[PDB]
Amino acid sequence: PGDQICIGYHANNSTEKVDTILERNVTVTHAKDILEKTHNGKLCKLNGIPPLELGDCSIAGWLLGNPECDRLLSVPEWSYIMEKENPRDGLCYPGSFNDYEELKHLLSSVKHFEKVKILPKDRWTQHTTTGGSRACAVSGNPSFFRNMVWLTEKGSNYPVAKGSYNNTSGEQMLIIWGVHHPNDETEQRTLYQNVGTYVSVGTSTLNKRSTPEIATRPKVNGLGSRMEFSWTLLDMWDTINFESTGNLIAPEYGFKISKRGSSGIMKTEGTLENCETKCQTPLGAINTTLPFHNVHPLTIGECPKYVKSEKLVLATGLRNVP
Amino acid sequence: PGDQICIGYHANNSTEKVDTILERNVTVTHAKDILEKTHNGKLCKLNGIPPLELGDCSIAGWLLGNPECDRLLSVPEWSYIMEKENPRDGLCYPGSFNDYEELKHLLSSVKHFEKVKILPKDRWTQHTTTGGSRACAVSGNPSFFRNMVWLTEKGSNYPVAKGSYNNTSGEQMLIIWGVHHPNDETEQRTLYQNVGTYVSVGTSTLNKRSTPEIATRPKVNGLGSRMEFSWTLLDMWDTINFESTGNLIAPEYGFKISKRGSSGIMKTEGTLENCETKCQTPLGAINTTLPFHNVHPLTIGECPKYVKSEKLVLATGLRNVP
Amino acid sequence: PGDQICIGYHANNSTEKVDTILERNVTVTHAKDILEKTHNGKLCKLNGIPPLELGDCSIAGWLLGNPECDRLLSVPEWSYIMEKENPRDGLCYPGSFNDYEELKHLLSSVKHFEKVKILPKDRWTQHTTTGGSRACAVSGNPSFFRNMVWLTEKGSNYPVAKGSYNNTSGEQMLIIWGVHHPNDETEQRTLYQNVGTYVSVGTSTLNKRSTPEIATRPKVNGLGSRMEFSWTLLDMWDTINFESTGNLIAPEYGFKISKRGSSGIMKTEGTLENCETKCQTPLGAINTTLPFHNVHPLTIGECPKYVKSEKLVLATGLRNVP
Amino acid sequence: GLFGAIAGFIEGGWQGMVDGWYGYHHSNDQGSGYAADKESTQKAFDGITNKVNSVIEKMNTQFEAVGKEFSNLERRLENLNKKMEDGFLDVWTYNAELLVLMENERTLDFHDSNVKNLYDKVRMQLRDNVKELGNGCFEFYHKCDDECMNSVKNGTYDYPKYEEESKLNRNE
Amino acid sequence: GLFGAIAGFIEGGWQGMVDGWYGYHHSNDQGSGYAADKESTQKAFDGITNKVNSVIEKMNTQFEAVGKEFSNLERRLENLNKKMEDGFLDVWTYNAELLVLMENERTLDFHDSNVKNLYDKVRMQLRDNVKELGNGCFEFYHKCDDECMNSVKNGTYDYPKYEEESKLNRNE
Amino acid sequence: GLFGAIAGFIEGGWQGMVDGWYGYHHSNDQGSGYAADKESTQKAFDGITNKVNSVIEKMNTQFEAVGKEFSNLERRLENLNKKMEDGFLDVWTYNAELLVLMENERTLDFHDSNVKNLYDKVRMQLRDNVKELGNGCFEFYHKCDDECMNSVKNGTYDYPKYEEESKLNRNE
Ligand SMILES: *[C@@H]1O[C@H](CO)[C@@H](O[C@@H]2O[C@H](CO)[C@@H](O)[C@H](O)[C@H]2NC(C)=O)[C@H](O)[C@H]1NC(C)=O
Ligand SMILES: *[C@@H]1O[C@H](CO)[C@@H](O[C@@H]2O[C@H](CO)[C@@H](O)[C@H](O)[C@H]2NC(C)=O)[C@H](O)[C@H]1NC(C)=O
Ligand SMILES: *[C@@H]1O[C@H](CO)[C@@H](O[C@@H]2O[C@H](CO)[C@@H](O)[C@H](O)[C@H]2NC(C)=O)[C@H](O)[C@H]1NC(C)=O
Ligand SMILES: *[C@@H]1O[C@H](CO)[C@@H](O)[C@H](O)[C@H]1NC(C)=O
Ligand SMILES: *[C@@H]1O[C@H](CO)[C@@H](O)[C@H](O)[C@H]1NC(C)=O
């Protein structure tokens, strides 16, 4: 019976488990979990910059100036935009918004606008501009989208309406305009006096026209009439020309793109809380140094890479043997 | 010369071959082929539910009611739709179908319609409705799409035609309408008496109009004229309004979506056989428990995963050594 | 002290390094670099067939026949098309080109055209055809796109203009036409005498019409007017019919697709050099037998597979041990 | 192979061992025959069954092509759709083929390791009561009956027991 | 495991060896105790640290979903977008899960190899001055003090030194 | 490495062995020199040649970017196209880089295994007619001439032949 040296290996009281191709549920002495599965359940500032919280307003409601969205008439730079799935306050006067999804996509790379009064309402001296609707009422009286101008007959006449704006603002500018599609001929006559009217818009690259369509339609927000909006990005130093014999809904303002960068519209019913993050998801903010997470695929900011995994655990130590 | 115990391994008469990164064509004692390469060459019922076999009819021919498609006037729930590459019976009266591919895509998630007589033909009391064409003839006489109504002059007059339908059916409803584009002015006058006509359609969300275009075009099915069809999905409890002074091709029916789920349109020249499957491909039905197949990428039902591989064989046993 | 046989392994003076999952920067006796990182910096013939070098011309400038592009009036088969990012010579008369990106995509699979005089200018006996513009001037005088015909008033009249062409050429044919949108009413009257004009185009499958839009727009190349071009592919044995009361810009020529195959439009500011390759990138031509390259993702010809890698080196020998 | 046993120092397989992947052949005064080692066979079977399930299960998260149609004015969109569906198809074919190749390599080497480890287990038990012939066999420095062979095959060989009997044989 | 040491011929681990992954337990007249082998532990630590970085770093080139919206007349385009984003998501989940599984397999086998190689290093040094017991231990054919044990643990055992002392012990 | 031979118990390589990856150095009364083992070298060469072809061939089913253009009103479509082409590019870069890393790991270990197996083959043949020094060398208990060295290098050493000559040397 003599002396001994034995070779052996570490064991401990670790219960950490990993999988292999050949075996599952192996206990190891040390392991590294590389998957973040937690978040704080809140919508936060992103690097100290708050999101734009639309509340009950849609993108269209904001930019057109639905009177229910007046808190948004001037907003500071944002880090992302929060929009509800079905915002209540959009087109108060019913209708449509051409290339709307394209406009929202643009907003993914815009972090601020400066709203510029490009076509001041008071310069429409040959037309009435006080036009509004009970569908956009404020304090019981007819009103209208704050950023738009409904031109109507003045003194029983509607002369050719021409407005133009040269973009001297120093950046590309978003401009929206509309055409009013009445319910009937009496509406057309009372509002515009003219028939067979048109709305023409022209820049160096855009030439888009419209003839209003009179037709009885199902009532929405009380009206069978509609307003159809369109938009363009006016390049620096380019001019936009509006020309109409009736039915033009003119912009008073343009939105100069004043800051660009990676942003996004987050779909959420929630509200901004007093918290800070580098990584925001629609479910809540992530604070981790782990390389992967499984929280949500639609994240904004400096985030880990998303995977569908329930677990990602790397063995680092050896098989833990009793 | 003493006793022996030897350690060894199994060999057999297996000729099963596998590949590795380091070696190809290795004989192993046991292996598992995980790739299904066979099918029954037939189009079958899918879980006992037969497909809708269009035969020589296109989707448009079916839904408009081309008289060559009369067997399809009422069809039961289906599991997939079989359509030929170039069906003969589509628009018998030549023309076009706006957003047709979008309509076919909708059908991938629809498994049944109930055709509802939304605008019964007899209620057009101020217009002629018996209008047809030799291009859609039946038994040697002019006829027309069974589901549509060609409104024409009655008593040498064409009053404003207005029809409306509130979708009380309990599901979203597919509705198609058209506009007739004549070859010449004499055709316009004989059919409608009016000039500078229009077709307007309006729901809570859709506002789409048209002015017919008179122009000489190459003859198709004998005609230089055309009919241009459009469609919409009418939401539950929404109303559709048709208004026209000429050239309207009105629907008589709507197609209520009565069953939803994963389906699809299979492109095939073949015919349904009396067989049953859980997995259908355009080449034939698959019956396997194997996890992969290489039969065709476009499958319907509960199928294995498709790969381009000619072989997928996993070694399970060891190298088979003589 | 006795005899010895030792087992050992090769070493050499190789400094070749490879990476593994467990270790980086390992010196090996032999290795195989499988990544091509070099190119010749030139644009070359591809298998002896030169590209079509547009120079300062755009695709539109070429096909319409901008007078600055006259060297391109007849061009032989090409292997790829070289286009600048912002070619100077496109629509000399300002306007737009409908479905332009679709047309460029078509060109990826076209290697030659035969330009066919489908509607010879001299057959417009009831209209003036010598119409041009200072915006497309040649030697100080007004001129016009070489492949197009600007129909105007003759003898103070503009009768209905009708032209038709049956594609007997033996292949599908690209045909372009336009509509002129004036700046004002005096322009419309001086050019066409008629008002409320239209341009209609019809084949067996296409029915596309237009009413010119008169409107003041910002000046481009000196003009507030515009020309809006459209195109179609006319099938073999199909007919195209043009009909107009004013504002038609007719094609004189069609482009018969005379050779098909894999091609492409390469965006480049450079010029063709006297060199030969099997693989062309926008940065230069590749000559390698290596399976991967990292030169540029947009290659034409028989090329290696592109990856973003800075290095791909496979160990073939063993660890090189001093 | 990697572990040097299969088609290595143990030069060939046994057609005569039909009841397992690895095992024994013994030879003594009472006779000779084959017997599978049940323990090591079962452990390899369990691993291999786990392997195949793993390879299948990881490729159940695979792309499926959906049938869509496009107009003659939607050729770029059609091409995008086609490039996408083909692209994923190529990725998944690659994943499947590579996984099978890499894992086939590992399966053959796993079996080689299992044979080597079984050999080593017996070797480390018999010690110098046997000669290692170099061919997978051990030749005993003593008579080893059926009960004696049975002890080796289940790891109950009594070396302290045969210690003296063998040294005399080994030296004489 | 692949190399037959961990949960193999060395049947279990040591709770009493807290300062490393692999090492020694000695027993002599002066006493007994545990000591980690620092060299082999550090080399494995370096490899494992490299492994984890590699697996992470290779999956930093990963797809990100971008939020886009589509009209009720853009359902095919919407579906294409969804199939694409889901498709890449499935590919990257597959890459991550597979990489972790395959590399976990290799990590356990790496540790097994490191234990076997350490054992073999000591074995090849002690030669016939010890008996191989078959359990990871070597029993000395001589008294081996603390300085003697310390020489083995850092590879400075003097075999030419104990050569004669042990043969007499081994034979007597 | 995994098999413990290369930069392991065989501490370094031989600049003097220029004709193969693995082999011999012998030393006797007649002299000394290097010789590659042709059989094991060729078998490894065949495997390595197969490996490189495999890695290349499996990534010939790779995505290609096609040049398409989009209007200023098709920004979502443009972004979808870009995300797709970039996405596949990232997937294929990942596949290529990972495959090369994993297979480089296996290539170094393959060579290590081949050296260990060659060593073991010679060991199991010479048996106790030699001493295992622990450094890759065997020292003979007899004079082993050039013809004798040549028999070992091609596996025709006659142990039954030198059996008695060596035991006397080994014991005396
Ligand atoms: C619009 O205003 C601009 C700025 O005053 C006018 O002038 C230039 O436009 C060019 C267009 O590329 C710019 O590059 C220059 O910055 C501008 N500077 C100058 C010299 O004026 C432009 O003329 C105006 N447009 C019209 C139609 O008058
Ligand atoms: C269309 O018919 C419906 C059902 O009769 C009418 O009424 C409601 O419509 C709302 C719309 O959201 C539904 O939610 C209800 O189920 C309906 N029930 C009631 C109380 O009638 C609707 O008024 C009709 N439309 C018109 C224009 O009269
Ligand atoms: C256009 O010209 C063609 C060729 O002369 C005319 O005829 C046929 O058109 C069909 C259409 O599918 C082709 O398949 C044949 O090759 C043509 N051959 C014959 C018999 O003519 C066609 O009639 C002309 N179109 C018109 C409107 O007259
Ligand atoms: C893993 O093993 C543990 C015991 O070691 C036991 O709870 C169970 O069998 C396994 N757990 C899971 C989640 O599979
Ligand atoms: C595989 O090996 C067999 C003989 O073992 C022989 O037919 C041929 O060389 C190989 N077959 C194929 C299909 O490569």
Ligand SMILES: *[C@@H]1O[C@H](CO)[C@@H](O)[C@H](O)[C@H]1NC(C)=O
């Ligand atoms: C790789 O090793 C070399 C010396 O062997 C040395 O230059 C450096 O540490 C490493 N080089 C790089 C590029 O990492």
Ligand SMILES: *[C@@H]1O[C@H](CO)[C@@H](O)[C@H](O)[C@H]1NC(C)=O
């Ligand atoms: C080992 O095998 C023998 C057969 O001779 C048997 O008697 C004994 O019980 C076995 N031991 C174990 C551990 O089962």
Ligand SMILES: *[C@@H]1O[C@H](CO)[C@@H](O)[C@H](O)[C@H]1NC(C)=O
């Ligand atoms: C080996 O260990 C002993 C401890 O007794 C020490 O004296 C000696 O310096 C060590 N040798 C080396 C290589 O450090």
Ligand SMILES: *[C@@H]1O[C@H](CO)[C@@H](O)[C@H](O)[C@H]1NC(C)=O
């Ligand atoms: C082995 O090598 C010797 C060289 O001395 C040669 O005579 C003999 O033929 C060789 N045996 C084989 C198997 O070729």
